[PDB]
Amino acid sequence: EPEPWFFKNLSRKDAERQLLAPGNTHGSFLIRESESTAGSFSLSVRDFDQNQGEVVKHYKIRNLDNGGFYISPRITFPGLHELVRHYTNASDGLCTRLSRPCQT
């Protein structure tokens, strides 16, 4: 649709406050447009650190030419929806498995 994890104009610092709000837990995520790098997307994910507690981590989602997304060129996807589906099924290298979209 509007896909529930897609918050395209959210800054890094607001993505962080958003994911660390009540209602979110480990694996809670959102995809936004990149702040530092124009043209890309960034995946923001809530995670559990052994010694630090709740933390937000950020990955770069990059464009393969035209219609290909990846975080690592190892696996690429036709759209952001398939990327999200993959890392919900298995962390596959990611700091954590993705569970549910950022609750607002």
């Binding site: 530092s36 960034s42 950020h58 990955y59 770069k60 690592s72 190892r74 290298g93 990611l94």
Partner: peptide, 11 residues
């Protein structure tokens, strides 16, 4: 400039 994570390779 702001920190991003990467997916590691297995070595």
């Amino acid at each position: 400039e702001p920190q991003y994570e990467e997916i590691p390779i297995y070595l």
